[PDB]
Symmetry: D3
Subunit: 101 residues, 6 copies
């Protein structure tokens, strides 16, 4: 009803490339974060931030990743970076209140 078999296979491949191999899942989700930030996709950034938090990334790990995206992608990324840090703070508050992420 929505899309084709090719669409479905592509979405599946997008999930698959973030599964752990020689690189662990936290590392791959941090890479997804970096790519999503330099390409300036807010929904993608939010998805990978959630995953990073779920996989036990620290705020400092996330910040150091975001800094690489900022330098590579330029000051044009700043509004997205700002939104990312704000969303991370919401996630940490949920954690402190015992809400499932």
């Amino acid at each position: 009803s929505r899309g084709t078999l090719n669409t479905k296979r592509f979405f599946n491949l997008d999930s698959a490339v973030y599964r752990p191999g020689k690189l662990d899942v936290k590392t791959k989700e941090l890479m997804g974060l970096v790519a999503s930030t330099v390409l300036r996709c807010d929904d993608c950034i939010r998805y990978h931030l959630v995953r990073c938090v779920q996989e036990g990334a620290s705020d400092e790990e996330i910040f150091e990743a975001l800094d690489i995206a900022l330098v590579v992608g330029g000051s044009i990324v700043i509004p997205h970076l700002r939104r990312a840090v704000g969303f991370l703070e919401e996630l940490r508050e949920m954690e402190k209140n015992g809400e499932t992420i």
Copy 2:
């Protein structure tokens, strides 16, 4: 060879440019120094960003650094796969070049020729 030479010459000039240009280049270096993320990981992140943004010289630079910091071909390829799926088939020409360059770096390693910048 050339790649290395041209990088040095650029940093030599960045005499020319401004204080702001110098400051930028210094930050570009700084953000890959070790923190809670180790330098291998940061250099792999640089590789991913460089690849999705389709900058061949950037790709080359971060491939060198990833090899220097002990990343395996399998680690590199897992990172390049994320870049490929996220950035699309337009990434393919860059991936092809990345793999050619990695093979050259591995041949240098095989022969004891130090991978330097």
Copy 3:
């Protein structure tokens, strides 16, 4: 704007008028370009036009799949929104409402 702005807007309209390529084809091209460049308002515009010119959901989906593979999984949020807007258009159609 200026005289230049008007001239540019006029060219943007003109390039989708049919020639050896028919209008459905050109509007589907507009949709593909809009999707890989991730412009929601552009996507919406060309979706309306594709529907107006008789494109089927399948033709639209086949085009969106090219944009997805060429442009990468970074386009997924826009593709999702494209399909949602198409469904809205189809529902308008079934309710006897005009796609203008």
Copy 4:
């Protein structure tokens, strides 16, 4: 929030628009052009405010936006529409104080 590197980068972003051989109005117009071709609404809004503060006329702004339009393609049109809407807002504020 962030690191010392983040702070330094934000500082550098401010610094590059300080006057030199190019005046601040010119530099802010360049930021406007860059922000428009790159399709960043928050960036466009920022540099519009600065352009207005530095005395740029609507005609100056329009001539800059035309460059961004041609360079960046018709894909920039939604952003150009929003820029102009926001410029009109700033001019109304100017009229009213």
Copy 5:
């Protein structure tokens, strides 16, 4: 590469197979996408396929005009290259030289 790399390449081929849109049309769409995204090797690939599938120069130019207007004057160097390459393919066609990938 990996199984995921292989799957991605398989999907890249698959999305151009005939459906309700014919292959000529799909390859022209590939051309437009490749051009606005300024990938020269991708443009060359799709030009070869367009030519192989019987597109005319006028059809190709109408497509390139969409990409030019949508993607901007930054596209011009790529359009120049595309037209040079197309002229090479037409010379091959004139000369009865098989065009194959």
Copy 6:
């Protein structure tokens, strides 16, 4: 390389022979938006340079550098513009900024040598 740049531009415009009316209109608009108005030509060409740099188009960068030099821009003015492009567009701009500086050096050497800079 400057000479190569000039001849390829020449041949393309000659070819835009095969352009549709739409292609020709677009090219004319591309020239028109840099003609002076309330903003002067040096300013508009410096904007073209900034836009071309953050979008990472080498031939476009080269074209606007020629025009900036022709219109009497200084290296300092050009570098202040390129710094905006670098910060905004990120370190992926660096390879292009390197090429830009190299090309500017070639133009300055032509100028020193009394060699006409033309397109």
